[PDB]
Amino acid sequence: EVQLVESGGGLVKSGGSLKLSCAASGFTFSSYAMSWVRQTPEKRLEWVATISDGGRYIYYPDNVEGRFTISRDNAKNNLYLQMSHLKSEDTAIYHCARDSSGYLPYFSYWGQGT
């Protein structure tokens, strides 16, 4: 059972920072690529970031790239998103997702939280 729960959450002001986390049990965490996908209050999905198996190849979109940062901990099986500068569009749900066994991700398993 692929399980993904999130922490951090938050209610911040503008220009602040926060660190979202993800716990990721049920499977061999260090093999798979992981990803963040947020959902706006007007119910639109947006890709946020992806990372590789060992944390080497990291992808961001242009709306995100200067001020978000993701990382892994393959010993604690944790996924991390470092949010910063928070310019008031960042008011979404921020799901975790496991990427497909592939080249570029299609999310198969999802985590509800935050």
| Contact footprint for other proteins (CB under 8 A) | 25-28, 30-33, 52-57, 100-104, 108
Query: CB neighbours of 107 closer than 8 A, spacing ≥ 6?
Result: 35, 37, 97, 98, 99, 100
Least distance (Å) between residue 109 CB and other proteins: 11
CB of 82 closer than 8 Å to CB of 65: no
Nearer to other proteins, 9 or 26 (CB): 26
Whole-Å CA distances, 96 to 13, 14, 15 = 23, 23, 23
Residue from 54, 81, 58 nearest 70 by CA: 81
Strand order in the sheet with 68-73: 6-7, 17-22, 78-84, 68-73
Nearer to other proteins, 30 or 84 (CB): 30
Nearer to other proteins, 11 or 104 (CB): 104
Least distance (Å) between residue 52 CB and other proteins: 8
Least distance (Å) between residue 55 CB and other proteins: 7
Least distance (Å) between residue 54 CB and other proteins: 5
Nearer to other proteins, 78 or 100 (CB): 100
